[PDB]
Design a binder for these strands. Structure first.
Ligand SMILES: [Cl-]
Ligand SMILES: [Cl-]
Ligand SMILES: [Cl-]
Ligand SMILES: [Cl-]
Ligand SMILES: [Cs+]
Ligand SMILES: [Cs+]
Ligand SMILES: [Cs+]
Ligand SMILES: [Cs+]
Ligand SMILES: [Cs+]
Ligand SMILES: [Cs+]
Ligand SMILES: [Cs+]
Ligand SMILES: [Cs+]
Ligand SMILES: [Cs+]
Ligand SMILES: [Cs+]
Ligand SMILES: [Cs+]
Ligand SMILES: [Cs+]
Ligand SMILES: [Mn+2]
Ligand SMILES: [Mn+2]
Ligand SMILES: [Mn+2]
Ligand SMILES: [Mn+2]
Ligand SMILES: [Mn+2]
Ligand SMILES: [Mn+2]
Ligand SMILES: [Mn+2]
Ligand SMILES: [Mn+2]
Ligand SMILES: [Mn+2]
Ligand SMILES: [Mn+2]
Ligand SMILES: [Mn+2]
Ligand SMILES: [Mn+2]
Ligand SMILES: [Mn+2]
Lengths: 99, 106, 79, 99, 99, 87, 104, 99
DNA sequence: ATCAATATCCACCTGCAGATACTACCAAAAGTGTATTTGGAAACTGCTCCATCAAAAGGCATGTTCAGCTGGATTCCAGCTGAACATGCCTTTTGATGGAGCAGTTTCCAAATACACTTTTGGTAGTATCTGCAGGTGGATATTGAT
DNA sequence: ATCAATATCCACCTGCAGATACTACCAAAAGTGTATTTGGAAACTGCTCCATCAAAAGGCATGTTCAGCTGGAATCCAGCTGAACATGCCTTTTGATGGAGCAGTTTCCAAATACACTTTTGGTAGTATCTGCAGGTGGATATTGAT
């Protein structure tokens, strides 16, 4: 069973996990989950796009975490940006200090 | 597969996928190891933030399942999220209740 | 009919959701004109995506992509 | 006398009603008709995914509703409560849709 | 006896004058100190290529002029010839700079 | 031997006559007295936004000088693309 | 023999090709892509230079300055839309006073 | 040569050619040439951008002239589009007819 | 003030669309281990251009006086737009059936990439000589505004 | 319709900044020629979902009446705002300075791509069971609008 399968991946399962961590007794309609998927896709593209330009401006062939950071700074509203950088640095540390 | 990079980073969002998506994205010739970690974290956080507010909005309306309306009230009632999604339209979101005062009786 | 199918009461309903209390008689004609121009602009782009993909069906992505580039991003049809 | 509501009383009641709901406000088919006719000018013998038509309706209505807000703001700017074509025209010119 | 142009005559004379020329209208140096003051509140010990200062001023006057037009459109909408803060505010709300 | 006098209240350097001149090019005939203070405010926001992004570019580049490209990239990303200063 | 001459063009097909690889727009770039693009760019350059030169001429000038470029663009409905979000340094604005402002 | 400043390429000589073609007795100020240069890069990016996106939307790893073409139809208004398309197709046909 | 006609609200109920949950199955995706490549940080420094100061001068800002005409208020009524009610015409829904065409698959070749030389070119640099026009003058014509 | 104060015009001129012209040099660009690889066009087609019916069912749109109340016209005046004048300051312009910092170069390795080999997992599909809440009820009470 591999024919009409052509995988249609989405962020939906990872959205759902995050939902329960914050509202474990709250659920979510299909249409709603779809909006959320569009949301992550949209933001992915914005950040990635800006990070890309950054690298090109500075004649670099590599998008690093530094680029993702400046990108976020450029793209998110002050306070939302502040927390994002915080969350960002955190996961990159936790990851380096890991196995 | 020993340990997923998401769990190494302490995240629910798929680091591996985000990394793959960056390369095929044609964003740069190359991609550092920290970048998908960082970005995946950033998406995760923002997702939480919206579900958080949107959740609350479900409560407020006597409901336990989030529908679009809830995400719309979530976003429009939040100065910053509303700015970020200022050129975005949430389907089936309706609008916040707001009547200009000069239209009010007497 | 057609554009004339977009009726006065429906135009009234939209206005209302938009906070409008009192509506001039001439609005319904003006509005239809505006809506026509919106759809023309969007549909053209959407269809142009259809032609590129060598299809005879406009897909929801065709519309979505076109909205996005009209600077009118839409969430919920990216499936 | 039989019972009549003052002019403006129901209008208020409708604003309150429709700001509360989210259902689309144009009849589905007349709209589908309109979409198809416009498209036919660009390419003939077209078929539309039904989700594609809904996208378009969602998008247009959002657009018109938001336009009515700015329109309402222009009428109030001139000490009126009645939206007029000059109000839509001004809003649009300032949006850069006519400039 | 001394000759006096009526009020409005010099104004029109000036509109004609300025619409005809391209030079900048804010004095260079005052403008520079503004830019320098504001930047410093963001980060200290910053320097500026003079062309970067000029880039800002060209952009800024371009923005402000276009704004005045929109504003002027708003005042005229209210049946006036005198632009007032409420006109700037209406303009900026519709442009999506405000609300 | 090193200067930098304190910079403050430079917004007032956007003089009433300069603001009038701008409104003229803008096609404006008559100007209410409260416009000038309002316009100063609107410019201040405009500059802040552009410089913030401009400086974010400078910083990301580990430079101490804001280049014209910085301002240019900053302007582009705010949808005020500017021609004439490179890039 | 250059590709520009081979495609009957003034604009550099080689450079356009190069910049397209350098830019990371896609994994691969077909050989017709830089040609078509050099073509379009050269065409639009020509369009705006025709119109600007005319405005230069209308003002008794022989050297195009930015005023002329602005005049050209803003007086032309299509270029004005193409560049509706672009600012031309040193361009000024189109002479234009609203009616209600004139006396009688 | 002073530690040879790395080369800053632009479109100036090509703009200049084209200029002599349309107005053989007209010159161009270096500031105006600067605008023209920004003009060309701006539009290069916009078309390449649209193409980049088109290819992606259709899982195509190559940008052909067909992508460039739709890009041009999506980006430019009516008449500029028609002519641009025309001149582009022509020039390609010529190019491939060689050899 | 009263009191009546409607709308609106809350509590409770119940059917069902749509969410949930279980199990099987599998490619494509993600991790891990090994061999190789290189982007771009570090170190050193050449050379541009930014900050800073000096000093001179006049363009343009500031501040004031004065009254012209605009905005803002008030009044007024003619008519246009909302409310309501009576029809009846078409949107909606639904259930059901061909069949267009989107999408999955295998094939294969025309075209893209990789690479190795070889030649051509645009950019800079240096040095030296033209030329379009801004900005100054002076004197003729056009606009304005007081009678 | 007259007159006079002032802006505006244009022709004229001249310094000169900026544009142009030559030589010289070369590093990067671009072309040419093969060998080696493959993206996606082509052609066959299976099944999803789209267009088209049929067919009530009635919901919702249309047409009409009537009058409230809003928009806009006319009138008035106080005072804000434009015009002009006098004074002089701080911006502008011209020129010179050290030196901070950007940018070019070469060195060199931590981290990337590049392949392969093993293991996992998120998506799809098939079947089954569960439940949040829309929509319908009834009966309370609030709002609106007439006296
Ligand atoms: Cl990284
Ligand atoms: Cl109107
Ligand atoms: Cl105001
Ligand atoms: Cl091609
Ligand atoms: Cs920001
Ligand atoms: Cs790009
Ligand atoms: Cs277009
Ligand atoms: Cs009630
Ligand atoms: Cs039910
Ligand atoms: Cs003064
Ligand atoms: Cs005075
Ligand atoms: Cs004149
Ligand atoms: Cs001179
Ligand atoms: Cs189908
Ligand atoms: Cs002064
Ligand atoms: Cs001064
Ligand atoms: Mn400060
Ligand atoms: Mn290297
Ligand atoms: Mn008075
Ligand atoms: Mn008035
Ligand atoms: Mn009456
Ligand atoms: Mn078929
Ligand atoms: Mn050469
Ligand atoms: Mn002159
Ligand atoms: Mn293949
Ligand atoms: Mn009124
Ligand atoms: Mn140093
Ligand atoms: Mn699983
Ligand atoms: Mn209910």
């Amino acid at each position: 069973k591999k024919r009409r399968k052509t995988r249609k991946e989405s962020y939906a399962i990872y959205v759902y996990k995050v939902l329960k961590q914050v509202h474990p007794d709250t659920g979510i309609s299909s249409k709603a989950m779809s909006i959320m998927n569009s949301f992550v896709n949209d933001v992915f593209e914005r950040i990635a796009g800006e990070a890309s330009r950054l690298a090109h401006y500075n004649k670099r062939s590599t998008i690093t975490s530094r680029e993702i950071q400046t990108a976020v700074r450029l793209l998110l509203p002050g306070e939302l940006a502040k927390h994002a950088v915080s969350e960002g640095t955190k996961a990159v540390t936790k990851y380096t200090s890991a196995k | 597969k020993a340990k997923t990079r998401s769990s190494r980073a302490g995240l629910q969002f798929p680091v591996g996928r985000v990394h793959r998506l960056l390369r095929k994205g044609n964003y740069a010739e190359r991609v550092g190891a920290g970048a998908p970690v960082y970005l995946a974290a950033v998406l995760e956080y923002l997702t939480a933030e919206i579900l958080e507010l949107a959740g609350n909005a479900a409560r407020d309306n006597k409901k336990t399942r989030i529908i679009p309306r809830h995400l719309q009230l979530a976003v429009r009632n939040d100065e910053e999220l509303n700015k970020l999604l200022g050129r975005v339209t949430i389907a089936q979101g309706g609008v916040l209740p707001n009547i200009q005062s000069v239209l009010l009786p007497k | 009919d057609n554009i004339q199918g977009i009726t006065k009461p429906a135009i009234r309903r939209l206005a209302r959701r938009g906070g409008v209390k009192r509506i001039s008689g001439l609005i319904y004609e003006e509005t239809r004109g505006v809506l026509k121009v919106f759809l023309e602009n969007v549909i053209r782009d959407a269809v142009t995506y259809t032609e590129h993909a060598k299809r005879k069906t406009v897909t929801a992505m065709d519309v979505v992509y076109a909205l996005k580039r009209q600077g009118r991003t839409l969430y919920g049809f990216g499936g | 006398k039989p019972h009549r509501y003052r002019p403006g009383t129901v209008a208020l009641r409708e604003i309150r009603r429709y700001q509360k709901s989210t259902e689309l406000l144009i009849r589905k088919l007349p709209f589908q008709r309109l979409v198809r006719e416009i498209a036919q000018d660009f390419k003939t013998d077209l078929r539309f995914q039904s989700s594609a038509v809904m996208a378009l309706q969602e998008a247009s209505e959002a657009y018109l509703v938001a336009l009515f807000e700015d329109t309402n703001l222009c009428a109030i700017h001139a000490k009126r409560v009645t939206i007029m074509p000059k109000d839509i025209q001004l809003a649009r010119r300032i949006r850069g849709e006519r400039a």
